[PDB]
Design a protein around this nucleic acid. Structure first.
Ligand SMILES: [K+]
Ligand SMILES: [Mg+2]
Lengths: 119, 84, 309, 61, 73, 194
RNA sequence: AUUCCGUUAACGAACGAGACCUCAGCCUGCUAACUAGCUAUGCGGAGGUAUCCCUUCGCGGCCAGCUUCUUAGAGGGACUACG
């Protein structure tokens, strides 16, 4: 079989994390980049790492990849996730409460709360 | 998201997701912490943090539903801790 | 106006890296490819195919990244990933000369206006100037040079002041004075590596595009940038129309042509496979015809598509 | 003596896996499927000559 | 080198490759492609060498794989 | 019809040769469209993958199966010569295309059913099973060459003559062929062990 | 493959595996070969119409050219790259 060992996976993950800006989806350019930005004792190991890095980049283009923390992806997610709607998704104008909640509020003395109506 | 926002605004630390065992007891662990207080959304799903805090003199606050276990819960807040 | 497909040329078997067109508007053209070969074409408008491969040269030992035709048209210079440049004679398909000295892959090669000086760009972060004999007169590998791969190098058409504009992968475009081979102007306005550089026929504009997907135009007189044009995709090639005064850019999504007068896209060319009858498929190089009435585009599928006005 | 075409291979059968169990569809009758044990290499799309089509194959193991 | 069959196979491969190269270099590329396709459609070994080579023998047997006869009593 | 300029031994033509058995049609290579060859000597790699040997010419498979028993191992030129002479004798005796005779012999010699051993622990129990077309072709070739070899042994008759006679008697179910008798015995045993 | 993905009161590691190194398989791309060869030429022998032309052999050219064939150094090449 062809299962990349821990060394190849770790090297590809770290290289993508540190140099995502220059990465491409072409194996040959990726291997040249690895030659430039990393020291790999063996040519075969360099080729394997380049191939797995290309695979990881192809996966990343689709969406998030677990174990790889890219600054731009996290920043974009935070920007999208810090937004709020124009109107809050909590309607206090009309509240449908069963009778039991009505006795609850009456015991609390809160029997006149606006927007509280029995089903 | 709720715990992240709570930590952001109150100024505390947040841990969202799985809790690493030994975070409160393994002093040589990288994620080792010594909190003075622990806040949990659900005692049932956060059983491991509560059990670990029971070994380190850490007070606990948790939002407890009608069926939540009260073991090692110092201040339980009775509320529905399942709906978003 | 609008551009429409004219035909296809299907000799290459790998990515097409560059296309060269004769000045005299002859039928022949020379294109490089990742198949380690240079194919000399015999264009024929009539017949099922717009052109056929007249000759193939396989001297290089690795991918040929660039090819340029001489002014006479009887010589062709092409660079390869083996870090060696060799002049080609389009008379018997035999190498006429070899240039040595580049330690890493050579990405850009250009011919001087007088066809008496040769400038090449290599991944070793160096630029060298060679004569026809085969000796590098000067090498630009000092602090003024770039800190990353010199992707593209071009010669300034204006003969009054001989000048070379070179891009790089460090988001910097530099201008060197040919007379003294010293830095003339430095440009830095890119966010991602720039892999293509173009010069207008007049010699007053320079289009730079790369990963950022934005085309930046700079003035050669002072280096000031005029404006920026978005592309929405990685830019691979840039060329100026000979007379129509346009700007065609090769991007991964498609080829888009801009009019510098109005800044609006003249036309967007998307390749469709059904009409003619690796999923990642895009144009890697483009070049206008001698008269500007035809556009040749190279693609990763080892196919050349021709657009006619 | 009928002819049937293999539609799918269920897998190896027998103590040593000598025979392969397949589902074969009769050519004369396209709506009748039968179970057969086959000796020797066999893949989908193969046609077998059934000397008798009455029997139903059962796992040898 | 080689033997009686290997020499013949090498000779035929060399003839095919030499003709293809001559047509490529001194004849129109169209005819070269035609002859190359004709040759390949019949047998790919006419232009591509077979990489098979003799396997080195290992101690403990006469052959590369064959081992000495084993006896228990 | 498909016309091929390739002639086996430059003497025999693959045209008008058609396999008349749908079961084993896809595992016999003896047609002008299925890569005809000039000689049954092709030094190809057919054991790389399963079912690949089905692409080898049937004449070449017969030649390979003619190299059995140690004294003849690796002697392929002699086997090719034997096949050539057998084909010449077949053409002389029957006046048909030798390739067609070989194909018919292969078709008629292949068993269709067999009894497979079942159970374990020293129990002699068998159950009838079907034979795949490729195994049927292999068994046909093996039986034909075995019959020829046994006929030629300790007999003035040459190996080529015995092979030609076996192929002729197998192209038609004459029951004088060794292969036909062996196939009949195998099918009888399979029927008995139903 | 205790190889990986993951699950996880475990987290981080150290050996083995892999990596590694030797040989073989591709390079008409690099360096260089009178202790390896090829090509053409000059001369000579034989044959064919016998001068000139064709075929085949033998001998020299360290100032005839070259490295396809041979040798051995540097490198390239495969990464399941692509569908
Ligand atoms: K005999
Ligand atoms: Mg050599």
């Amino acid at each position: 079989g062809r299962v990349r060992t821990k060394t190849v996976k770790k090297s590809s993950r770290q290289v993508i994390e540190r140099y995502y800006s220059k990465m491409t989806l072409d194996f040959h350019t990726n291997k040249k980049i690895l030659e430039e930005v990393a020291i790999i004792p063996s040519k075969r190991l360099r080729n394997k790492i380049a191939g797995f890095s290309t695979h990881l980049m192809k996966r990343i283009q689709k969406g998030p990849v677990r174990g790889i923390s890219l600054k731009l992806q996290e920043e974009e997610r935070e920007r999208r996730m810090d937004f709020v709607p124009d109107e809050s998704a909590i309607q206090t104008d009309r509240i449908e409460v069963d009778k039991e909640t009505i006795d609850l509020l009456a015991s609390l003395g809160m029997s006149e709360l606006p927007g509280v109506v029995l089903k | 998201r709720a715990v992240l926002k709570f930590a952001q605004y109150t100024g505390a630390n947040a841990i969202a997701g799985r809790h690493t065992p030994g975070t409160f007891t393994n002093q040589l662990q990288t994620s080792y912490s010594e909190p003075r207080l622990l806040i949990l959304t659900d005692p049932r799903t956060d059983h491991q943090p509560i059990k670990e805090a029971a070994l380190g003199n850490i007070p606990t606050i948790a939002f407890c539903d009608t069926d939540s276990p009260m073991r090692y819960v110092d201040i339980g807040i009775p509320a529905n801790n399942k709906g978003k | 106006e609008s551009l429409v497909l004219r035909g296809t040329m299907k000799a290459h078997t790998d990515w097409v890296t560059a296309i060269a067109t004769p000045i005299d508007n002859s039928d022949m053209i020379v294109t490089s490819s990742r198949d380690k070969s240079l194919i000399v074409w015999s264009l024929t408008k009539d017949g099922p195919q717009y052109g056929v491969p007249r000759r193939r040269l396989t001297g290089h030992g690795h991918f040929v990244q660039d090819v340029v035709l001489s002014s006479d048209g009887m010589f062709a210079l092409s660079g390869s990933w083996d870090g060696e440049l060799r002049l080609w004679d389009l008379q018997a398909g035999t190498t006429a000369r070899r240039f040595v000295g580049h330690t890493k892959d050579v990405l850009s090669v250009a011919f001087s206006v007088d066809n008496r000086q040769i400038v090449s760009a290599s991944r070793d972060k160096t630029i060298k100037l060679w004569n026809t004999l085969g000796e590098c007169k000067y090498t630009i590998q000092e602090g003024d040079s770039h800190s990353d791969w010199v992707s593209c190098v071009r010669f300034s058409p204006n003969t009054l002041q001989p000048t070379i504009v070179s891009g790089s992968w460090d988001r910097t475009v530099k201008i060197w004075n040919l007379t003294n081979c010293k830095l003339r102007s430095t440009l830095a306005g890119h966010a991602g590596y720039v892999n293509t550089v173009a010069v207008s026929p007049d010699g007053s504009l320079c289009a730079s595009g790369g990963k950022d997907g934005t085309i930046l135009l700079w003035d050669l007189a002072e280096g000031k940038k005029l404006y920026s044009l978005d592309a929405g995709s990685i830019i691979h090639a840039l060329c100026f129309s000979p007379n129509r005064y346009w700007l065609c850019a090769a991007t991964e999504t498609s080829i888009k042509i801009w009019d510098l007068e109005s800044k609006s896209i003249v036309v967007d060319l998307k390749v469709d496979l059904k009409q003619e009858s690796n999923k990642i498929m895009y144009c890697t190089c483009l070049s206008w015809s001698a008269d500007g009435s035809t556009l040749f585009s190279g693609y990763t599928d080892g196919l050349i598509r021709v657009w006619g006005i | 003596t009928k002819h049937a075409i293999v539609v799918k291979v269920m897998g190896r059968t027998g103590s040593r896996g000598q025979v392969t169990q397949v589902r074969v569809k009769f050519l004369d009758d396209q709506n009748r499927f039968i179970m057969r044990n086959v000796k020797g290499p066999v893949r989908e799309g193969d046609v077998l000559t059934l000397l008798e089509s009455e029997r139903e194959a059962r796992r040898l193991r | 080198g080689g033997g009686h069959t290997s020499q013949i196979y090498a000779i035929r491969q060399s003839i095919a490759k030499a003709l293809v190269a001559f047509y490529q270099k001194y004849v129109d590329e169209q005819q070269k492609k035609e002859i190359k396709d004709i040759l390949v459609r019949y047998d790919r070994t006419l232009l591509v060498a077979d990489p098979r080579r003799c396997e080195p023998k290992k101690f403990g047997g006469r052959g590369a794989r064959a081992r000495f006869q084993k006896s228990y009593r | 019809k498909v016309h091929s300029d390739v002639m086996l031994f430059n003497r025999w033509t693959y045209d008008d040769v058609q396999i008349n058995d749908i079961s084993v049609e896809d595992y016999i290579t003896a047609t002008a469209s299925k890569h005809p060859v000039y000689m049954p000597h092709t030094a190809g790699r057919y054991q790389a993958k399963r079912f690949r040997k089905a692409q080898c010419p049937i004449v070449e498979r017969l030649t390979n199966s003619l190299m059995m028993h140690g004294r003849n191992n690796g002697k392929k030129l002699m086997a090719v010569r034997i096949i050539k002479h057998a084909m010449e004798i077949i053409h002389l005796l029957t006046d048909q295309n030798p390739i067609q005779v070989i194909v018919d012999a292969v078709i008629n010699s292949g068993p269709r059913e067999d009894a497979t051993r079942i159970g374990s622990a020293g129990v002699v129990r068998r159950q009838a099973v079907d034979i795949s077309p490729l195994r049927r072709v292999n068994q046909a070739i093996y039986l034909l060459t075995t019959g020829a070899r046994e006929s030629a042994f300790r007999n003035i008759k040459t190996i080529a003559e015995c092979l030609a006679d076996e192929l002729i008697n197998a192209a038609k179910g004459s029951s004088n062929s060794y292969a036909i008798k062996k196939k009949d015995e195998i099918e009888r045993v399979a029927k008995a062990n139903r």
